[PDB]
């Protein structure tokens, strides 16, 4: 039976329809237009400016007009709060709790919830599920979730952690290649937007680099990551609350330090080409690697070891310099990399870049959003 | 040659005089006897016994003057005066002999630490005046970390904030004292050392490569890093921002500095020993004290792990200051987290060590070595003086 997967983006809405792990139909929204891929042909259609639930509606309509029967719809919801400990098939109780999670991620959740609501209304005979990014980290203990602050603030700002579906998908895909049930894995979700690391013991999250918010942890494209806590306070005394929030989230990270780009590839280019901003670009790369390595080290001690270091996402799977720099700093722990394989790998498949003799293995593992949402559908429905 | 060391405290000023690594005179201002039908006084300990001079309540420079006067009247001649300055800012990459330039630069560092810097400054100014033919030096707590490179001092934020909020690091004098004391015991110049200053007030870790600070736990402020007695340490940067919205700026600063850390989580005490005691006696606050210990250990372990990767390995882990020297449960908790890295702890030595002297707690076969190293406040300032004047 057919599965429809929605992928909500900043300025777009993509979909893909699956039948037995095979793509039937696909396309995306945003002069704005919707593009469709069906029966081997490409249909582009001019549109006026749409919001997300309008785009979703139009996609459903196109599917109905072509008799693409749909039995399942999968959705991604970033921040499921304290309620959602696992992903869920969508009912009235789930819808209620989801709506209470809206203020948790005002940038992500609302447009995601909008698509869900319109999808439930336009496809009332289909079973629908929501894949929740924070759920995988429900195995993290109190002590690892707790910041050293007094009540009531202590319970208000517990750590949540994110990219949970990505981590869960990657772990699941490594089950034939390694023995996850007896393993210590550190996964690095290095993407555009958010980046994080996760310490995984026997297939389960033990700790992660993000916190109560998606600002915490690693240096990111435009986000500061972990910094001295008095700094946000001092900056507020200069420019106020909302401006500080904007700077730390949209004008920091690789962008703020390189003074060139939020894209690591542009940063690497400027360094290796020399280059009018190399200086700042070199600093941005060093600071990024430092924080990443520091994060890896901290997590390794928490989980009591390391068998496999995994890179995933866009940066993790397409930038060999990051993986090389990181493995060099972790060489003393027993990481012997194969540089021929590393420099050519773009992570289109699960590929080890480590010599088989190396004490700690290093691998790359794809985490395509659509396959990730679909995979959760399997777990919930068995299809 | 005698050396006068001033230790500026909160309610009083204390001092010691050294002659060849030994104390010949010492004292505390503003002393009170609860049964002594009497006034506040300076208590002097000199050779034989106790000398009490009744005084009004004294500030620090007033006490300093009267202390100097007492030593003159009792024929203790002074060749050097040592002082301690908490935050030297950008200018002080080294501790310094005090001249006109140094005094001018120290003056500009006052807003860095409104409480501690002016107190130590006032004592320095009066000390230069009452002993103007005496060489004096200021030991700067931030100077040891001048060797930390830009990438390690830099937070991933844009200009101009990036340069306004560079990392400094503290407990520098404690670290370089411990490192120096280790030169009689290990090859420091070819060593990777992580030191843990586990104090009653602030706490930090330092990654040390060949005798020099590579990176450290505190940042621009003395709030960053480890979970501390009353401080939060490193937390989600969004948390202070959201707390401002609830209770305002100044209240948040007070909460994170004075009502967090061990005190805030345990809901019992700021002292680790009381926390351990409550756990083991199963007091009414055992659950929260157990949580406070777990959170504290977790952050310390994570900090050590991060520093190890930064410096490229680990040969020697060293504990110092009050909690590091006199609380074996903390050391055990840490070493068990790191057993996988090659730490074989002699549990009998650890349970009996109070860190009165440098002694290894690990087996000599153990890949990574663990030791406790004393860092008495006065010897630390005195040692900086030996380095500057060769006394």
Identify the most extensive interface between protein chains: A-B, 70 and 72 residues
Which percent band covers the strand fraction of chain A? 15-25%
Reported CATH architecture of the largest domain in chain A: 2-Layer Sandwich
CATH topology of the largest domain in chain A: Nucleotidyltransferase, domain 5
- What is the 3D form of chain A? globular
Strand order of the largest sheet of chain A: 5-4-3-2-1-6-8-7
End-to-end Cα distance of chain A, whole Å, is: 7 Å
> Roughly what percent helix of chain A?
25-40%
Round the Cα radius of gyration of chain A to an integer and report it.
21 Å
Q: In total, how many domains does the architecture of chain A comprise?
A: 2
CATH level 1 class label of the largest domain in chain A: Alpha Beta
- Derived from helix and strand composition plus strand pairing, the structural class of chain A reads alpha/beta
Beta-strand segment tally of chain A: 14
Which superfamily, in CATH terms, is the homologous superfamily of the largest domain in chain A? ATPase, nucleotide binding domain
The number of helical runs of chain A is 15
> Can you write the helix and strand succession of chain A as a string?
EEEEEHEEHHEHHHEEEHHHHHEHHHEEH
Q: What's the assembly state of these chains?
A: homodimer
Largest sheet of chain A: 8 strands, mixed
Binding site for substrate (chain A): 76
Keywords (chain A): ATP-binding, Kinase, Magnesium, Metal-binding, Nucleotide-binding, Transferase
Active site (chain A): 133
GO biological process, one term (chain A): acetate metabolic process
């Amino acid at each position: 039976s057919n599965v429809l997967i929605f992928n909500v983006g900043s300025s777009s809405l993509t979909y893909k329809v699956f039948c037995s792990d095979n793509i039937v139909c696909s396309g995306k929204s945003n002069k704005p237009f919707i593009e469709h891929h069906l029966n081997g042909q490409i249909i582009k259609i001019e549109t006026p400016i749409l919001n997300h639930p309008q785009a979703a509606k139009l996609i459903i309509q196109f599917l109905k007009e072509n008799h693409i029967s749909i039995a399942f719809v999968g959705h991604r919801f970033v921040h499921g709060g304290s309620y959602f400990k696992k992903s869920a098939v969508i009912d009235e109780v789930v819808l209620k709790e989801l709506k209470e999670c809206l203020p948790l991620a005002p940038i992500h959740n609302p447009s995601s919830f909008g698509v869900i609501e319109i999808s439930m209304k336009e496809l009332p005979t289909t079973r629908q599920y929501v894949a929740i990014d924070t759920a995988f980290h429900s195995t993290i203990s109190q002590a690892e979730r707790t910041y050293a602050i007094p009540q009531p603030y202590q319970s208000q700002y517990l750590k949540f952690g994110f990219h949970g579906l990505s981590y869960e998908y990657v772990i699941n895909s490594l089950k034939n290649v390694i023995d996850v049930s007896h393993s210590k894995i550190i996964a690095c979700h290095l993407g555009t937007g958010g980046s994080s690391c996760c310490g995984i013991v026997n297939g389960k999250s033990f700790d992660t680099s993000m916190g109560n918010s998606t600002l915490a942890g690693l240096v990111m494209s435009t986000r500061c990551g972990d910094i001295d806590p008095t700094i946000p306070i001092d900056m507020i005394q200069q420019v106020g609350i909302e401006k500080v929030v904007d700077i730390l989230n949209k004008k920091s990270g690789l962008l703020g330090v390189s003074e060139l780009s939020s894209d690591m590839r542009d940063i690497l280019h400027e360094i290796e080409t020399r280059g009018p901003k190399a200086k700042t670009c070199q600093l941005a790369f060093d600071v990024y690697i430092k924080q990443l390595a520091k994060t890896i080290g901290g997590l390794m001690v928490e989980i009591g070891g390391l068998d496999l270091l995994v890179f995933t996402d866009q940066m993790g799977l397409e930038v060999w310099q990051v993986r090389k720099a990181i493995c060099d700093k972790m060489k003393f722990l027993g990481i012997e990399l194969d540089d021929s394989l590393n420099e050519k790998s773009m992570g289109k498949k699960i590929e080890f870049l480590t010599m088989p003799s190396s004490k700690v293995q290093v691998c790359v593992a794809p985490n395509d959003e659509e396959l990730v949402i679909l995979q959760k559908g399997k777990e919930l429905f068995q299809f």
